[PDB]
Design a binder for this molecule. Structure first.
Ligand SMILES: CCC[C@@H](C)[C@H]1CC[C@H]2[C@@H]3[C@H](O)C[C@@H]4C[C@H](O)CC[C@]4(C)[C@H]3C[C@H](O)[C@]12C
Ligand SMILES: [Mg+2]
Ligand SMILES: [Zn+2]
Ligand SMILES: [Zn+2]
Ligand SMILES: [Zn+2]
Lengths: 49, 45, 334, 243, 389, 102, 50, 49, 92, 69, 49
RNA sequence: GCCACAGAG
């Protein structure tokens, strides 16, 4: 039964977070060019790297 | 050509063009087509 | 040392150590004279369907190659194609064809020729590469059966279709080549099918020769396997009642108690299936050790009935030698 | 993935890759799409490739690494009482490379009685086969089960049961290979170090070598579980009873 | 999980299973009763119609192909009938009589110029219904139904065409008359299947798994007597799942088959382990069922004892022949002009919201455009620049 | 007439002087590779002999032979094949004389 | 017309020996308890209520 | 007291040491006491009166 | 009475236009099969059945670097696996 | 449905031992574990082949469609 | 040199869909989470969700 | 075609 609620949670989270991206000036912005974060996580470091 | 088997009385019988789909020796209305006489080849595996 | 030691939880020293580079002495180079002097064969039993023989002072790779070639590379003759005329049984045609293909045929494989696959079916099967077996059984009610009987062998006429009903139909020169050795199944009592009145079976089976790797029905051996010679060392004498307990850890004929000193000694290590039961009991720790001789194989080759087990082993050795010769004669393409 | 063509009517993937999929071979069905344009093909192979995605973006830890039955075989090779002569060493080295890679046999760890190579030298050759391979990785890591040494002054590698693994150059000087060093979830693993220092191709090559070695070694060196491994000893049934 | 998968095991259905015409019926050629029984098995007469075979199992890591529940099968064991099964399917047709005093007909056999039936009618017979016992491939006809066009009337051809990945044999043809005096024709088709890669096997303790590899007998391990396991199962399935009952089943079955009597695995009871250990040690085997096996590849002794004995395995109804599907281009829906749904309609696989979002997470713009526009529903359209319509 | 497709020398894996080589042999499996491995490791000049079946679906066998500078790998392979032939001949002779003995 | 449950007291298979089961092409080990409607054998499942 | 007594080359012990499959708890449950059964954070609720 | 499929019913839900046909949709050139292990493949490889590979095709445009290869594939045809199923001409 | 011709594991022919096994159980009143050994079924893989066999062919033949039942 | 190279390659590359990555990296542990009973710092009467 | 349950991971 946990998958039924977890799928909806994931769908909501993605439909709220899909538009963000890291621009070429290292500022995370929405699709409407509004800043969410000035640097990603405060230091601009990739969690993958 | 005898081609059909009554499913109850097990009598080989043939159907013409105007014959009803029922056995002649009894009232059973289920007929099974008999095995063909043509060669069938199988691989023994 | 060449003794595979057997412990209570693991098996030690399982790999061959006879090659230069194992130590600074750099001995055990391949010498055909030394191998000719050291190798030994001892046949202990030789029946028409089962051979037991010891190969001594040979490496594990060669014996395993012989076993594998015996199982899946020595050709044998078995039914391959089945043509059906009016199979009215409960048993399906696929199942009946598979069962007929699984019967062993008493045919010498050297009297046939390999079937060329790319040839078309009109000329694929000739008198040199195909044995025809015809089966024709019709079951009818017994008119004079006992009233109180219930055995189908008495109530019906041909209620049991066996493998001995597979008659041999010579074609062409097989009328003269197979005159003194007619094709019969190796196990005539194989129960192929069961019938009831009104049912009939009639079929023609084309039998060719193939290897066991292609299908398991072509394997000439029902089983073909070896086992290392067991070895039981009694490091300290075992006296009295404990010896009787020491007798119960092994099969009955393996060890015995001498009547004079009343101590246990190994009588026949060959009968010892290695169950390592004696390693369970703490009293026999540091008193007995178990092992297997790594270069002492006891082959037990049981034939399926087509041909003798000694012929099977000889054919396996010849096949390995021919593989080596064929690889030696080939040119190496860059 | 790059496609290979096989005749056996099932999709087949390396078992190191079933962990991102959360897949087990108990009836799982998977899907296969084929991009139909050059741009889509290049984007898929350069952004979604297995080599370029060895690490999960959730934490940066490896997610494509040794799974079950590859950790066990590697542990049994790298066990402290594993000693191989030159024939078994050479067969193992050919078993991880399809008999193609050139191997430079190092001098043995034991010389006077016999010539015996430890399995840690086998994995040192697995990481770096010859002098032409550029993979030179150095790391220190703890295993899953680490038993600290007798004295607190002693270093971690002088512990019992080979708890601490040290790789200098490419030789494995201590420790065993387990889920901490070859599996997923830890940032001190061998494959993570190879990927970070020498690119994804060398990490993929090392994983392929490990998988090919452990897919053929554990059959010839058997590993089994029975009820003897589960039954308790005689005194345990009394200590448990009294407690 | 065993309670779930026992209802999907392939085996004998009933004593009249060959007189039945069911829409889907899986049968096993050589069913065997379990070596380790239960009182419930005897009470419900499950041993009279069993579903499964006693396979010689060596619990060991053989290749890399047994990882993650996958099983290693023996090719020689499969060649001798292990896991052989058959599938029987029913196709039914009704020759309905329309209100215009017109009815469907069955006869028809388009003979060629030489005097032989055409390829589509190669196994169709003179009466219009396919002959019993002959092989039907994809594209052939086994029911040659014709429908009057106006519903001397003219009949259009609406035949029943077999289609599938493998050929099938016509097992039974039946004609009858329903209650409303309309002719009913049923054709039961059978096809024989052997285990392959992807076929699902269960082991009566959960422990489900598909076949990962099929290897030859000489590549398999063997004991002193030459016994070769039919199924090799990975040891790594036991510790996380804790099926000690499976090991007890193996030892009970081994001791029973050496002693010659079926054993009982009855809940809160059954055959005790000490008796089976005594039986095993009296027969020259280890008390724990761990035999010493030589490997078939290199011939040397395995450096660990192998847990070796008979386990009852069930072949489940999920086989890869019924699951494989591929589309490329095919039918499209009339409304949305997108690929249809299901492999019965040659449909396409859905790239849902989660997969779309996973593709987004990689940053693959062109791959997303190709998957969601080019390959699914691309359409060239004319838009006005002024009114925007 | 000779079988050119039977045994091949994989150019990309051999050495320049022929000391190390890898040979691809078609239509063989462990039953010949293991015997060749055992026989070739008894050559004093061979320091590496190992076979492999890259995939069960392919009937193929890759065997790698690396020697010292005394002889090339091709000579080691030919010597191993001849020596395996001699081993089979000796086993054949002993078995066929012990059959006639009893 | 009431569709009768197989192997009930109104069925033809009630307290019938194995020979009569063979005469009617019915398996003696069939559990029974279902209804044959339009050729399909349907089972009325047990319902759980308060 | 169960884990410290099992000898080397014990397959569940090896598989727990590797981390390939299983844990110490599973071995202890198979060889020794299974332990308390916990439902919703508590012990077994009073199904009857 | 079953409620009719109005215009709003065609747009809402998981089977509507937005979630069933716009955000995600069924695609061509896709296949689904049971998976089984194969350790001999590299980690960046997947093994596809030859039956599936003969259905799933890739449209390769003929260049000056691959003309002979595609000629050979066309010659082999749809039945031999290293082949081709369709040809689309430049002017057609 | 009928006794298999060959043992699945090794390959020994056990299809000719079914009638003899039934005769030794019925006429000679031997126990099931000794009749198997008297027929040469030493390996347990062969013993399970006819010890666990269910002869369903007799039950299937009661519904003969070619002859009144 | 190694430290500076590792730092300069660890920056978040422009164009990354970092919002989708975060949404997935939050949703997926929700799938992996099993439901357990917790308490607030050693007292059993809290049962904080 | 629409519903209805049945299963697979
Ligand atoms: C074309 C191949 C022929 C080959 C299969 C024939 C021709 C020569 C035959 C052997 C010799 O007769 C010597 C022995 C005689 C004993 O009685 C049985 C074994 C024995 C080794 C024979 C086996 C077999 O019968 C051989 C090898
Ligand atoms: Mg699963
Ligand atoms: Zn009649
Ligand atoms: Zn306009
Ligand atoms: Zn057997």
């Amino acid at each position: 039964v946990k998958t039924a609620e977890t799928g909806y949670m994931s769908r909501r989270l993605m439909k709220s977070l899909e538009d963000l991206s890291c621009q070429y000036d290292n500022t995370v912005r929405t699709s409407a060019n509004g800043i969410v974060q000035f640097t990603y996580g405060g230091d601009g470091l990739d969690p993958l790297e | 050509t005898l081609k059909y088997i009554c499913a109850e009385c097990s009598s080989k019988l043939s159907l013409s063009r105007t014959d009803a789909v029922r056995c002649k020796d009894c009232g059973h209305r289920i007929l099974l087509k008999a095995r063909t006489k043509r060669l069938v080849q199988f691989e023994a595996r | 040392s060449n003794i595979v030691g057997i412990e209570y939880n693991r098996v030690t020293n399982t790999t061959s150590t006879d090659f230069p580079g194992f130590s600074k002495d750099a001995e055990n180079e391949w010498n055909v004279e030394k191998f000719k002097k050291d190798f030994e064969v001892n046949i202990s039993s030789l029946d028409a369907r089962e051979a037991n023989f010891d190969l001594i002072n040979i490496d594990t790779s060669i014996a395993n190659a012989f076993r594998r070639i015996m199982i899946s590379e020595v050709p044998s003759v078995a039914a391959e194609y089945v043509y059906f005329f009016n199979n009215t049984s409960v048993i399906q045609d696929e199942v009946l064809a598979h069962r007929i293909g699984l019967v062993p045929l008493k045919v010498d494989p050297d009297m046939l020729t390999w079937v060329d696959s790319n040839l078309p079916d009109d000329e694929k099967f000739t008198d040199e590469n195909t044995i025809v077996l015809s089966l024709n059984v019709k079951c009818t009610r017994n008119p004079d059966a006992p009233k109180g009987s219930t055995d189908p062998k008495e109530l019906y006429n041909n209620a049991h279709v066996y493998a001995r009903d597979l008659k041999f139909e010579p074609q062409g020169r097989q009328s003269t080549t197979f005159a003194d050795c007619p094709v019969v199944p190796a196990d005539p009592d194989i129960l192929l099918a069961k019938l009831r009145p009104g049912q009939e079976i009639s079929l023609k089976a084309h039998c060719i020769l193939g290897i066991g790797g292609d299908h398991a029905k072509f394997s000439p051996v029902s089983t073909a396997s070896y086992r290392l010679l067991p070895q039981i060392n009694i490091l300290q004498p075992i006296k009295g009642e404990s010896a009787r307990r020491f007798q119960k850890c092994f099969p009955p004929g393996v060890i015995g108690i001498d009547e004079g000193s009343d101590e246990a000694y190994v009588k026949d290590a060959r009968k010892d299936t290695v169950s390592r039961e004696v390693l369970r009991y703490e009293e026999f720790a540091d008193k007995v050790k178990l092992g297997r001789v790594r270069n002492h194989f006891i082959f037990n080759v049981e034939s399926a009935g087509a041909m003798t087990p000694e012929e099977i082993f000889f054919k396996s050795v010849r096949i390995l030698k021919n593989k080596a010769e064929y690889l030696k004669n080939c040119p190496i393409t860059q | 993935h790059y496609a290979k063509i096989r005749p056996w009517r099932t999709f087949r993937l390396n078992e190191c890759v079933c962990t991102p999929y959360n897949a087990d071979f108990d009836g799982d069905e998977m899907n296969l799409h084929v991009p139909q344009t050059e741009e889509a093909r290049a984007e898929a192979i350069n952004l979604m490739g297995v080599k370029n995605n060895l690490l999960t973006p959730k934490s940066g830890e490896p997610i494509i690494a040794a799974t079950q039955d590859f950790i066990t075989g590697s542990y049994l090779i790298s066990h402290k009482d594993s000693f191989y002569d030159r024939a078994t060493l050479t067969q193992l080295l050919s078993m991880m490379s399809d008999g193609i890679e050139h191997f430079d046999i190092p001098p043995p760890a034991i010389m006077k009685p016999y010539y015996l190579w430890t399995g840690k030298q086998v994995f040192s050759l697995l990481i770096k086969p010859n002098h032409n391979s550029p993979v030179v990785i150095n790391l220190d890591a703890k295993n899953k089960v680490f038993v600290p040494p007798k004295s607190k002054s002693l270093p971690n590698e002088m512990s019992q049961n080979d708890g601490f693994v040290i790789i200098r150059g490419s030789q494995i000087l201590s420790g065993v290979m387990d889920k901490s060093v070859l599996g997923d979830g830890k940032k001190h693993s061998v494959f993570y170090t190879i990927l970070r220092d020498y690119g994804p191709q060398e990490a993929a090559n090392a994983m392929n070598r490990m998988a090919k070695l452990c897919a053929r070694f554990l059959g010839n060196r058997g590993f089994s579980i029975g009820i003897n491994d589960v039954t308790p000893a005689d005194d345990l049934k009394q200590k448990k009873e009294e407690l | 999980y065993q309670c779930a998968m026992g209802k999907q095991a392939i085996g004998a259905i009933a004593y009249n299973q060959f007189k039945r015409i069911d829409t889907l019926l899986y049968l096993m050629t050589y069913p065997q009763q379990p070596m380790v029984k239960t009182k419930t098995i005897e009470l419900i007469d499950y041993d009279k119609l069993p579903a499964g075979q006693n396979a010689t199992v060596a619990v060991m890591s053989y290749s890399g192909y047994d990882i993650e529940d996958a099983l290693v099968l023996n090719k020689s064991s499969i060649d001798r009938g292990f896991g052989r099964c058959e599938t029987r399917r029913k196709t039914t047709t009704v020759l309905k009589r329309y209100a215009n005093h017109t009815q469907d007909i069955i006869g028809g056999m388009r003979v060629d110029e030489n005097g032989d039936p055409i390829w589509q009618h190669q196994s169709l017979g003179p009466d219009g219904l396919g002959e019993v016992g002959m092989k039907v491939q994809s594209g052939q006809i086994y029911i040659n139904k014709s429908v009057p066009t106006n519903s001397q009337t003219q009949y259009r051809e609406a035949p029943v065409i077999y289609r599938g990945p493998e050929p099938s044999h016509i097992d039974q043809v039946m004609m009858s008359v329903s209650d409303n005096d309309q002719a009913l024709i049923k054709v039961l088709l059978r096809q024989n299947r052997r285990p392959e890669l992807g076929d699902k096997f269960s082991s009566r303790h959960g422990q489900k798994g598909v076949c990962g590899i099929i290897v030859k007998q000489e590549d398999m391990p063997f004991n002193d007597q030459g016994i070769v396991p039919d199924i090799i199962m990975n040891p790594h399935g036991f510790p996380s799942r804790m099926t000690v009952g499976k090991m007890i089943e193996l030892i009970s079955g081994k001791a029973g088959v050496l002693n010659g009597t079926l054993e009982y695995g009855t809940c809160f009871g059954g055959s005790k382990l000490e008796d089976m250990s005594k039986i095993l040690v009296d027969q020259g085997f280890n008390y724990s069922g761990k035999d010493m096996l030589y490997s078939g590849i290199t011939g040397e002794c395995l450096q660990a004892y192998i847990f070796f004995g008979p386990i009852y395995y069930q072949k489940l109804k999920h086989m890869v022949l019924d699951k494989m599907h591929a589309r490329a281009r095919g039918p499209r829906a009339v409304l949305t002009r997108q690929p249809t749904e299901g492999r019965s309609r040659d449909g396409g696989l859905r790239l849902g919201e989660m997969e779309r979002d996973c593709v987004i997470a990689y940053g693959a713009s062109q791959l997303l455009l190709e998957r969601l526009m080019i390959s699914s529903d691309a359409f060239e359209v004319d838009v006005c620049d002024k009114c925007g319509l | 007439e000779p079988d050119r497709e039977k045994i091949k020398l994989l150019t990309q894996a051999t050495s320049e002087d022929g000391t190390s080589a890898s040979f691809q042999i078609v239509e063989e499996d462990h039953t010949l590779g293991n015997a060749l491995r055992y026989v070739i490791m008894k050559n004093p000049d061979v320091e590496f002999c190992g076979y492999s079946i890259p995939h069960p679906s392919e009937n193929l066998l890759n065997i790698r032979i690396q020697t010292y500078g005394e002889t090339t790998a091709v000579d080691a392979l030919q010597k191993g094949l001849k020596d395996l032939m001699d081993l089979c001949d000796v086993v054949e002779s002993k078995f066929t004389e012990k059959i006639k003995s009893m | 017309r009431m569709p009768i449950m197989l192997r009930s007291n109104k069925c033809i298979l009630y307290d019938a020996d194995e020979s009569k089961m063979a005469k009617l092409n019915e398996c003696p080990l069939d559990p029974g308890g279902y209804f044959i409607v339009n050729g399909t054998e349907k089972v009325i499942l047990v319902q759980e209520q308060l | 007291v169960c884990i410290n007594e099992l000898d080397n080359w014990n397959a569940p012990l090896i598989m727990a040491t590797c981390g390939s499959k299983g844990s110490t708890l599973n071995v202890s449950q198979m060889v020794a006491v299974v332990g308390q059964q916990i439902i919703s954070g508590n012990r077994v609720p009073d199904g009857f009166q | 009475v079953k409620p009719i499929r109005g215009f709003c019913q065609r747009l809402k839900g998981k089977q509507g236009r937005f979630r069933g046909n716009l955000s995600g949709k069924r695609v061509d050139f896709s296949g689904r099969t049971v998976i089984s292990p194969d350790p001999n493949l590299s980690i960046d490889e997947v093994a596809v059945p030859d039956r599936v590979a003969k259905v799933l095709t890739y449209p390769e445009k003929v260049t000056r670097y691959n003309r002979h290869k595609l000629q050979e594939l066309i010659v082999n045809g749809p039945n031999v696996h290293p082949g081709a199923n369709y040809l689309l001409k430049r002017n057609e | 449905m009928i006794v298999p011709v060959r043992c699945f594991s090794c390959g020994k022919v056990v299809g000719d031992k079914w009638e003899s096994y039934l005769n030794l159980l019925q006429e000679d009143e031997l126990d099931e574990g000794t009749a198997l050994s008297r027929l040469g079924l030493k390996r347990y893989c062969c013993r399970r082949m006819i010890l666990t066999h269910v002869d369903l062919i007799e039950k299937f033949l009661r519904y003969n469609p070619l002859e009144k039942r | 040199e190694i430290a500076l190279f590792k730092y300069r390659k660890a920056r978040l590359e422009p164009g990354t869909a970092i919002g989708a990555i975060g949404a997935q990296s939050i949703g997926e542990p929700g799938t992996q989470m099993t439901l357990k009973t917790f308490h607030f710092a050693g007292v059993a009467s809290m049962n904080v969700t």
